[PDB]
Every structure is written in C-alpha cells, then in structure tokens.
C-alpha cells in the first residue's frame, strides 16, 4: 500500500500501482485492458524472484505472495507463453500480430530459435519492410541499415561476408517487397518463422533410465524427444491426442496414454522449479489443442 509496478510489452512500458491483495489475474487483466488485446490465452507475465530465476506469474494468486524481487518498481514482462498452431488462422488482431512478431524476431536474433542464413536474410528483409516501408533510392542510400540489428550472431560468424555485404543482401530483398504493408510484412515474417524446427518449442534437460542426457520438447502439437546435440530433429513424438495424463513426483515424469492397453512413458527431470513449468506448459498446450478441435 501502494506498490509501484512496471509491466513491459515488446514495444511499450506500462506503469501501474497495486495493493497487497492484488491478484496475478488483476494485474494481467489491467495490462490486457490497457493494450486492448483480446487473444489473452497465449500470454502471461514474467518476473524475477529473489533467487534470480525467471518465473511465470500465477494468476489465481496474490502478487505479493509469489516472492517477486523486491525493488521500486516491481518488474514484469508481458510475453507469449503459448504459440498458435498457425499464425494466419489464430492471430486475428494486429496488436497480437505485432507482439508475436516482435517476440519471435528477438528470439531469432538472440540465437534462441535456430535460423539458417538465407532464411535469416529473408526474415530480416521483412523486418526492414515493416520498419522502413517501401524501398526508396533517395532516402535509403547505401549504409542505411548500419544501425539495425538484422541477423542472428550465428550467421554473422560462419561466413566470410562483411557486415556491409550482408546489408546489401538484405537491401536486395527489401527492394522486392515494394507495396507490402506493415501488418502483412509482419505476418509474412511469422509464416516463415513458424516453420522453423525450433519455433514454439520449450526445451528442457531430460534423462532416460540409462541416465542418458536428452532434450524434452513441449509445443502446440505435443511432446518430442531430441538427442542432446540436435534440437532440430525430433526422435520420438507424443501428440496431444495420444495423451491421457501428465504428472511428476520429485524427479520423475509419468505420461499415461489414451490407449490404456499401452505402457506408461516415463522420464527424469532434475529441478522442481523447472518441473512445475514443464507441467504447466503441458496442461496449457493440451487445453488449447482441444479447444481448436471443439469450438
């Protein structure tokens, strides 16, 4: 009484005030009212706790009873926690499109979502079209892209190409997007991005019986197992339609199938903090999966 809070979207900074009784749902609904977003089911709020870990805020719980890092103001990020199976069909509002575009671009540039060079150049090209508008020889003389972060670091290292040569390659594509509007340019970026192997998947350190280190992938379509040094190639898949239950205890996850005449799939995950997030992402991704097939 009263508690200053800052919530940041991808392109805005919001300043609110909360009371000791304010619930996660209340702060969340205020952000949504302020921003005018209706596709609320993809999003959540992130905070840093007193131990330093990034945590998703629980909505049906008081903000002051979640061990948010004590500072003036309290810091929050409004981000997408879930991703649609198809951007074209599910991202209706332009605000939803913009917020997704910006979050995905950031993850591609931070090398969190892998993207090969040619595709990265083409993606940068749409970002340039979205920011700059139509190519214009009079305004966009060589060097105009020098103060833009356009490519993932992974790309800038592997090649012999200079920064300026990369900017020429991106310019060349930008010229070809002539009459493309901002909204369409962001959607074209998203359509290409969503087909990337690492797009929309949450990766977690995992183990089998033998103790072999693997990756677990949680996404819109189901669960996937990856070998430790290849996050691009699913080795085993668990579609949501084939899953009855997911639970964990201490360090063991049990996935029960629909079939009932089929064996349980079990794996091991080290940290409780992480396992809670794994469980929550499964439930959410499973619920949204069903909704799309039962309107």
């Amino acid at each position: 009484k009263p508690i200053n809070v800052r919530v940041t979207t991808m392109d805005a900074e919001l300043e609110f005030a909360i009371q000791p009784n304010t619930t996660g749902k209340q702060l969340f609904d205020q952000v949504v009212k302020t921003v005018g977003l209706r596709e609320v089911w993809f999003f959540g709020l992130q905070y840093v706790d007193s131990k330093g870990y990034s945590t998703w805020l629980k909505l049906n719980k008081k903000v002051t009873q979640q061990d948010v890092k004590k500072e003036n103001p309290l810091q929050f990020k409004f981000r997408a926690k879930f991703f649609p199976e198809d951007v074209s069909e599910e991202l209706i509002q332009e605000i939803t499109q913009r917020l997704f575009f910006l979050q995905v671009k950031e993850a591609i540039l931070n090398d969190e979502i892998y993207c090969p060079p040619e595709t990265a150049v083409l993606l940068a090209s749409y970002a340039v079209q979205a920011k700059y508008g139509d190519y214009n020889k009079e305004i966009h003389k060589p060097g105009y892209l020098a103060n833009d972060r356009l490519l993932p670091q992974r790309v800038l290292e592997q090649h012999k190409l200079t920064k300026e040569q990369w900017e020429e390659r991106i310019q060349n594509w930008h010229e070809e997007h002539r009459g493309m509007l901002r909204e369409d340019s962001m959607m074209e970026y998203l359509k290409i991005a969503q087909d990337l192997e690492m797009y929309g998947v949450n990766y977690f350190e995992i183990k089998n019986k033998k103790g072999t280190e693997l990756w677990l992938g949680v996404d819109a379509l189901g669960l996937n197992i990856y070998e430790h040094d290849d996050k691009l190639t699913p080795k085993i898949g668990f579609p949501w339609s084939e899953i009855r239950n997911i639970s964990f205890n201490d360090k063991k996850f049990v996935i029960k199938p629909i079939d009932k005449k089929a064996p349980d799939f079990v794996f091991y995950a080290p940290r409780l903090r992480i396992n809670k997030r794994i469980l929550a992402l499964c439930m959410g991704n499973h619920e949204l999966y069903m909704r799309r097939r039962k309107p």
Partner: peptide, 20 residues
C-alpha cells in the same frame, strides 16, 4: 512433410527412448 517425429506405437516409443 514438416519436421515431425517418426511414426510408431507407445511400446516402440519406450524401446527407442530407453537406449538412445
């Protein structure tokens, strides 16, 4: 086809997982 996991039943999933 998109980059999806190879098709198999749950017993085959467990066998493949268990010696990766």
């Amino acid at each position: 086809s998109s980059k999806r996991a190879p098709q198999m039943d749950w017993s085959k999933k467990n066998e493949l997982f268990s010696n990766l």
